[PDB]
Each structure stands twice: as C-alpha cells, then as structure tokens.
C-alpha cells in the first residue's frame, strides 16, 4: 500500500508452503489476458470472490491467516474459466489482447475486437459481460454505437476478422 524507496533492494526467500495448505493451480496469466477475461471470471466466480472479501472482512486481525481454504477456492474457479476459454475462443480472445497489448491497456482501443468475442463466449461458454451498478435507461458503453473516443489505430487482423464476422453472419 505504499510506493518504494530511495534505494530499495528486492529480496526473496526460497521456502515453501509449510504443512497444511495443499498446492493450487496458481494463475499463470499475464495482465492482458486476465484483463480481457476479467468480466467473465467476475461473472462466473461472483459469489466466490464476494465470499472472499466477506471472510477477509469478518476476520479482523486474523485476515490473511484465516481464509486460506478460500484463497484456494477463488483462484481455482478463475483458472477453470481461463482454461475453458483456452479451449473455447483462443483465437479471438488472444486477438483481443493482441490488440490490447498496445494502447497502454486502455480499454478504449479495441471495441471491434471486443464485440467479436462477446458473441463467442456467450455461444460456447455461455457467459456474458454485465456492468452492475448501471441503472437502466443508460447504455453500457461497450454496447453503444458511434463512440466519441474512437481509438488510435485498430489492429489490422481484427478489423478483417470483424468484416468476416459480418460476411459469415456470426455478428
């Protein structure tokens, strides 16, 4: 919760998870894939993560030491989601963060690559991006048409993929 030093030195410890906690399948996803699939792991693993922050709340002082069962719980289901999308829409999902690896991860960059993915995951993995807190008669901003902030350079692959989504009638 604090920025680093004048001259901080990094350090690590070659030790292990000692006795009781079994090993987990720890998320080996870099920022751009998990940022892309953030809505879907928030959609499927909603009450699990909600339980996580609830249990971290009620464990005042215990905190970190209490909910190890739950840190085991909430990561694994997200790993299940990303493995299912590794099997599901790996071309288009990868393409979404092939676009999103530029633009400083600004989500404003890759609308045309995004809407191709929204049909795909809702087809096979049958999940959906939903923005909570958005009261009705208010357009969700990745659903709207003619945005004000149009991005800098759309990638060359997903624009052709978008045209082919129109020609195949998948859109």
């Amino acid at each position: 919760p604090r920025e680093a030093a004048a001259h901080w030195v990094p350090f690590e410890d070659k030790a292990n998870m000692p006795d009781n906690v079994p090993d987990v399948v720890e998320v080996g996803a870099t920022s751009a894939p998990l940022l892309s699939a953030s809505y879907f792991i928030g959609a499927k693993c909603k009450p699990y993560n909600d339980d996580f922050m609830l249990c971290r709340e009620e464990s005042q002082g215990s905190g970190a030491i209490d909910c190890l069962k739950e840190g085991r719980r909430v990561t694994r289901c997200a790993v299940s989601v990303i493995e299912d999308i590794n099997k599901s829409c790996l071309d288009e999902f990868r393409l979404h963060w092939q676009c999103l690896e530029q633009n400083n991860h600004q989500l404003s960059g890759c609308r045309k690559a995004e809407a191709l993915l929204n049909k795909c995951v809702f087809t096979k993995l049958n999940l959906e991006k939903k923005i909570p807190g958005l009261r009705p008669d208010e357009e969700p901003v990745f659903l709207k048409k003619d945005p004000w902030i149009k991005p800098a350079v759309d990638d060359f692959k997903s624009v052709r993929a978008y045209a082919e989504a129109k020609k195949n009638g998948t859109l």
């Binding site: 690590e12 399948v25 633009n103």
Partner: protein, 86 residues
C-alpha cells in the same frame, strides 16, 4: 506563388522534428519489443507490471497466456526492502 526562401528553414525545422519523432518512435518500440509505450503509469499498473515481469520469465512484457504457473512462480516472488530513512 509564395516566398519559398522564407519557408526553407521552416521546411528544415518541419523535417527535423519529423525525423526526431520517427527515431523516437523506433527506439521506444525497440525497447518495448513490438508494442507501443505506456503513457500512464498507475500504481495498479506498477504492481501489475512487476507481477508480469515476475511471471513471463526474464523478459519485460512478453505477455504470455498460460493455464497454470511455472514452479519458479511460487519462488520468484519478492518483497521490497525499503532503507531505514534517516
């Protein structure tokens, strides 16, 4: 038409800033290795990119997509030793 001799040093400066911007594109992409720059360092993003260097192995922003972790991922993770601040 126009006095070209007046615009000729302006043509120079218009070329000089252009060549500067071309080289300052090329060097930054060559540092990044294929992607553009990052025009906004967030604290969220700073911790995130530390995690990403920690994940990919060696390289800066290789940005890999993997199901699970490597075995060194449980061991590569570091803390920061801030000095005594006297």
């Amino acid at each position: 038409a126009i006095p070209f001799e007046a615009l000729l040093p302006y043509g120079i400066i218009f070329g000089l800033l252009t060549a500067g911007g071309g080289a300052m594109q090329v060097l930054h992409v060559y540092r990044n290795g294929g992607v553009r720059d990052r025009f906004a360092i967030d604290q969220w993003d700073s911790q995130m990119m530390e995690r990403d260097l920690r994940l990919n192995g060696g390289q800066g922003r290789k940005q890999v997509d993997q199901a699970t972790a490597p075995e060194a991922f449980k061991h590569n993770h570091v803390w920061k030793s801030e000095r005594p601040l006297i």
